[PDB]
Structure formats: structure tokens, C-alpha cells
């Protein structure tokens, strides 16, 4: 199918400042009829998509003139002259020239704020869980900005990838930060064969990783 690739994945915006989103198609969207069937959608969280542009550059009814679309061939751009609060959400490009019609992967507009380091907390498996024959180690990394963060688990000093489950909140409505949970699940037997457990976070706020650890034989 025609692949629609959006750049960037996330755009950090400031209210009053411009924004630009790109869409590249794998094949020309110029129809043999001479028209180019490239649309833009906005989806706000938990809401249905709504079209703002059709035929590359035509604004839907009610769309403010702060929005402009351009493009031809394989390259398309959506511009917002000055971002407003109500513009935040995920924008998708959408081609109908080639059957079947296809959609880009989306570009999220999020609010820029000052960098904030994560608050990192680690928790051993509960005794209740350990009776189950399973063992989960939980790491919270809370209230950080920007959203880009790398989390690594170590067991007895060696990096561990298998058995990790991560989950992320959306940007907070009050403080514009992000939070994350990382859970490492082992069998009880494997858990009890090691002493040291570490959650390590790399985030731009510091050059060195944030390390939270426990040892089973310590407080």
C-alpha cells in the first residue's frame, strides 16, 4: 500500500509560536484526474478524528486561517502560524489518491516546558506475590520532561531485557510532565538466585544515569 511517513513523531510547541509537520508518501499522490487527494486530520485525546484540510490546501469549514496546507507529489506540509491550546493533539495525513486509501502514523503536538528530572522509586516483590511463584520488581519514573527517557534493568550488575513491561502516561494537564512505570517479572526461583536489583534511567537532565537499587539482603 502507499506508505505515509510523518516527521517529526512529536513536536514540542509553545503557545503563540509556529509549528510545521511534514508528510512524505511512498508514491506520488497526483491523481490521473489532475487532483491531489491529501487530507489532514486532528484527533484530540479520547475524541474522534476531525478533518481540517482536504485537497492539499483547502480548509474545512470553521478551521482558522492559522492553518495552511501545501504540497505536491510525495511531499506535504501542514503549518500553524501560531499554536493555540485547542490545537494540541495528534495530526494525521491521509491519502486517497491510491486505492486503498492510507493514513500516516501521526505527529503529536505537545507543550514545551522546562526540563525536569524524573523522580525514580524502586520496589521489591511483595511477600504476597512471592507465594504465587512469581516476582515483579517495580520502578516508577515520575514527573519528567522531556518525554524521551531510557530505562534499563540490571540484576547483579548485568543488564536484563527479558520480562520487562513498560507503561507511560500522557502529558499531564497540570504540570506538562510525563511519567512511566517499568516492571520486571521473574519466577520466584530466579528472583531468589540473585541479590541486587537496579532500575537505571538516562534522561537529558543529567549526563549520568539515575540509579535506584535494592539488595535482598539489605534494608
Amino acid at each position: 500500500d502507499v506508505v505515509m511517513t510523518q516527521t517529526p513523531l512529536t513536536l514540542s510547541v509553545t503557545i503563540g509560536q509556529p509549528a510545521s509537520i511534514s508528510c512524505k508518501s511512498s508514491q506520488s499522490l497526483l491523481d490521473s484526474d489532475g487532483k491531489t487527494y491529501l487530507n489532514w486530520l486532528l484527533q484530540r485525546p479520547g475524541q474522534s478524528p476531525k478533518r481540517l484540510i482536504f485537497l492539499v490546501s483547502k480548509l474545512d469549514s470553521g478551521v482558522p486561517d492559522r492553518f495552511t496546507g501545501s504540497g505536491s507529489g510525495t511531499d506535504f506540509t501542514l503549518k500553524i502560524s501560531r499554536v493555540e491550546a485547542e490545537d494540541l493533539g495528534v495530526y494525521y495525513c491521509w491519502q486517497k489518491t491510491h486505492f486503498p486509501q492510507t493514513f500516516g502514523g501521526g505527529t503529536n503536538l505537545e507543550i514545551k516546558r522546562a526540563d525536569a528530572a524524573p523522580t525514580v522509586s524502586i520496589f521489591p516483590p511483595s511477600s504476597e506475590q512471592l507465594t504465587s511463584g512469581g516476582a515483579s520488581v517495580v520502578c516508577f519514573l515520575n514527573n519528567f520532561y522531556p518525554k524521551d527517557i531510557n530505562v534499563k534493568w540490571k540484576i547483579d550488575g548485568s543488564e536484563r531485557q527479558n520480562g520487562v513491561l513498560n507503561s507511560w502516561t500522557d502529558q499531564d494537564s497540570k504540570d506538562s510532565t510525563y511519567s512511566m512505570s517499568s516492571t520486571l517479572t521473574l519466577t520466584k526461583d530466579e528472583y531468589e538466585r540473585h541479590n541486587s536489583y537496579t532500575c537505571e534511567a538516562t534522561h537529558k537532565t543529567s549526563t549520568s544515569p539515575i540509579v535506584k537499587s535494592f539488595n535482598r539482603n539489605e534494608c
Binding site: 491521509w94 486509501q101 506475590q129 513491561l165 507503561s167 511519567s179 516492571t183 539489605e218
Partner: protein, 214 residues
């Protein structure tokens, strides 16, 4: 008043079929094509097909030919999307749309899992551990089916400083966690309890966080 009203959420077992509906008001569905679109969080938006209710003509995306059947009941101004031989890959929001109007979407969940209450585990910090002016506690809510659970702290009285994470699917079961950050002045003298309701299993569990006082 143009309005596309879609049918309610459905939860079905793998292999089943469902028939989603989309009822129009404020116009005649016979006048315009109706489309259906699938949306998943990871994989994104995918167009399924259209139907022309004026003549019942249909066109499907090749990938949905085996899977989707569109019909319309023009006498009741309703379009239907039947989805068959369902699998977990069909778990999605489905939208109907006509002209430049989208419906509100219908959530479809497809699974082979059996109803399972969560195992709820406390995430207790150390007491002797004095973590700056604030303390983070949590609960792990593991291996439940289906969604949703409802997580509260102190029976709903504690909402500030809470992060309840989106569920993720582990081997057909859901897991999530919730953290709460409280003033260290208050803890552990004021107790902290998570409450986790799972109506699908007739359960609601409370886990009081007891300080790990080594």
C-alpha cells in the same frame, strides 16, 4: 442536526463475529457513501471500505475482504459492519464516517482469555527510608481480564500525586500499576490504602501499605 450514533462497546471471544451499527440522523444515508475505519494505538488508522446505501454497492480494502461485510438498512437509516473470524488483531476502535462527519467510535475487544480478578500487591517503601519531603507508594494490579479496573487511593479521598498507568497486555492478561506520592510529614502516621475494583469478577480489593521497617 447531523449525528452518526454508533453502537456500544463489545467484548467477544476469538473466532466470534460481531455486527456494529451506525445510525444516522439529520440526513438520508441513501444520499452519500458510508465508510468504516479501524484504529489501533500501535498500528494506527486503517480504512476498511465503503458502502453506497442507494444501491448497496460495496468496496473493501483487500486486507479486509475476508473479514468485513458492510450492509445498510435504509428504512432505519442504519449502516452495519459485520466482522468475522475475529482475533486479537481485530481489537480496535471502529468508526463510521460519511461526507466529513465521523461517528464517536465503537471499541471492540477480542480475546481468548477467561475472566480473572487482578492480583493486587502493595508497593511499600521503607519507613526508616526518609525520601526527601515526599514519599512514593504504589500498588501493582496484575493479571486481570477484562478491562477495566478502577483504582482509588484512600477510598477516593487521595487523588493528588497519583499516577495510574495504562494497562498493558501480558500473555492475554492485563497488568497496571498506580503510584501515589504523599508528604513525608504524613507517612506512615496517616495510612495509605489502594482500592482496586474489578466489576467483571465481582471483586474489589484493598491493600493497606505497611512500611517496610527492616
Amino acid at each position: 442536526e447531523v449525528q452518526l450514533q454508533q453502537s456500544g462497546a463489545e467484548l467477544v471471544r476469538s473466532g466470534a463475529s460481531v455486527k456494529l451499527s451506525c445510525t444516522a440522523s439529520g440526513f438520508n444515508i441513501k444520499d452519500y457513501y458510508m465508510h468504516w475505519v479501524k484504529q489501533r494505538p500501535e498500528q494506527g488508522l486503517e480504512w476498511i471500505g465503503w458502502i453506497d446505501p442507494e444501491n448497496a454497492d460495496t468496496e473493501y480494502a483487500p486486507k479486509f475482504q475476508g473479514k468485513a461485510t458492510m450492509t445498510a438498512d435504509t428504512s432505519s437509516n442504519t449502516a452495519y459492519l459485520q466482522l468475522s473470524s475475529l482475533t486479537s488483531e481485530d481489537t480496535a476502535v471502529y468508526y463510521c464516517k460519511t461526507g466529513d462527519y465521523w461517528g464517536q467510535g465503537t471499541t471492540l475487544t477480542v480475546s481468548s482469555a477467561k475472566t480473572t480478578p487482578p492480583s493486587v500487591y502493595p508497593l511499600a517503601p521503607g519507613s526508616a527510608a526518609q525520601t526527601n519531603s515526599m514519599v512514593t507508594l504504589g500498588c501493582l494490579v496484575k493479571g486481570y481480564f477484562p478491562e477495566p479496573v478502577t483504582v482509588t487511593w484512600n477510598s477516593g479521598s487521595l487523588s493528588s500525586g497519583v499516577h495510574t498507568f495504562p494497562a498493558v497486555l501480558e500473555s492475554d492478561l492485563y497488568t497496571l500499576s498506580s503510584s501515589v506520592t504523599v508528604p513525608s510529614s504524613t507517612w506512615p502516621s496517616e495510612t495509605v490504602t489502594c482500592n482496586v475494583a474489578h466489576p467483571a469478577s465481582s471483586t474489589k480489593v484493598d491493600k493497606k501499605i505497611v512500611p517496610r521497617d527492616c
